[PDB]
Subunit: 92 residues, 2 copies
């Protein structure tokens, strides 16, 4: 994922109070009393990659002339859109 | 994967019909007639990064000892969970 440093404000402090509370439930370290959280605190963002859509670069012949088309497609709705249409273009 | 050559043929031809159909609505090239789509055809996949959750690495003091806590948070439920809790560790 992506990593970033956050500071030691009340949100970060309560993250430390969470960890000490859960550890005291397990009971392997003995009764711990939360003191403070110090720098550096690291926050990692976990992502899932998913397809938003597609794009296409076409060479299409129409009425015996050759054009360049640029189409986009949405993954979920399957709806298309024509972005560009230039011609006549020389063959590739 | 970002950019790729896709083959021509049935799915590609229907993209060529769409581009001509859309362009016939504008009319700057006049009434066209779809002929065929030729090589090379490019496909560009567009991905979307959605957040699955977060993870925090902390340096926590408790009962005058310094521990390293790894806690996790969900993006949808916002629920916290302690993954690891080791110590004492040397300070940064």
């Amino acid at each position: 994922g992506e990593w970033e440093i956050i500071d030691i404000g009340p949100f970060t402090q309560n993250l430390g109070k969470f960890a000490v509370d859960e550890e005291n439930k397990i009971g392997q370290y003995g009764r711990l009393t939360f003191n403070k959280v110090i720098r550096p605190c690291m926050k990692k963002t976990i992502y899932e990659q998913v397809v938003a859509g597609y794009e296409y670069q076409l060479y299409v012949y129409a009425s015996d002339k050759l054009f360049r088309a640029d189409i986009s497609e949405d993954y979920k709705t399957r709806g298309r859109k024509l972005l560009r249409f230039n011609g006549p273009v020389p063959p590739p």
